[PDB]
Amino acid sequence: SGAIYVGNYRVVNRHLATHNDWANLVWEDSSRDLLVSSTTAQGCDTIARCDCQTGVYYCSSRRKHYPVSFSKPSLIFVEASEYYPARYQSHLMLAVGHSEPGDCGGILRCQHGVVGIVSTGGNGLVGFADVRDLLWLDEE
Numbered sequence: 128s129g130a131i132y133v134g135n136y137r138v139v140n141r142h143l144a145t146h147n148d149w150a151n152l153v154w155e156d157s158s159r160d161l162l163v164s165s166t167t168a169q170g171c172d173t174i175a176r177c178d179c180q181t182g183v184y185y186c187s188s189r190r191k192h193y194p195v196s197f198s199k200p201s202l203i204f205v206e207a208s209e210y211y212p213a214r215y216q217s218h219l220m221l222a223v224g225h226s227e228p229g230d231c232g233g234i235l236r237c238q239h240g241v242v243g244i245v246s247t248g249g250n251g252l253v254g255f256a257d258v259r260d261l262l263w264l265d266e267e
């Protein structure tokens with residue numbers, strides 16, 4: 128579990144979005160595993176605006192943050208998990224690391240701020256849903 132809190136926006140994994148998220152929907156994309164809802168209180172996070180390929184992510188199934196190198200966002204085949212069938216996922220970054228289903232929502236960060244959230248795992252990789260292209264998160 129986990130979210131990004133930027134301005135008056137909550138960014139969550141689409142598959143973990145709540146009824147209240149859907150009732151306060153700003154934007155969602157199944158292909159990216161992302162949903163954004165509106166919040167009453169302003170949040171503490173800053174979104175990265177960059178093309179970094181090094182950062183640190185939180186792994187809840189290890190209670191640990193890990194430094195990783197990751198691929199630039201692309202359109203990648205993902206094998207079946209407990210929460211999605213085998214399918215193509217867009218705007219996905221991969222690194223070598225540990226990721227189980229419950230790790231979804233952990234933050235990946237670089238020197239510029241939040242890069243994305245854990246969205247995939249298995250076979251010794253961790254996959255992150257990028258948010259750095261979503262410039263509208265910084266305003267309005």
Ligand SMILES: CN(C)S(=O)(=O)c1cccnc1
Nearest residue numbers: 199200201202216217218219
């Ligand atoms: C839609 N994209 C912006 S993406 O990140 O899924 C992508 C797709 C193809 C090549 N490189 C990146």
Ligand SMILES: [Zn+2]
Nearest residue numbers: 177179237239
């Ligand atoms: Zn960066």
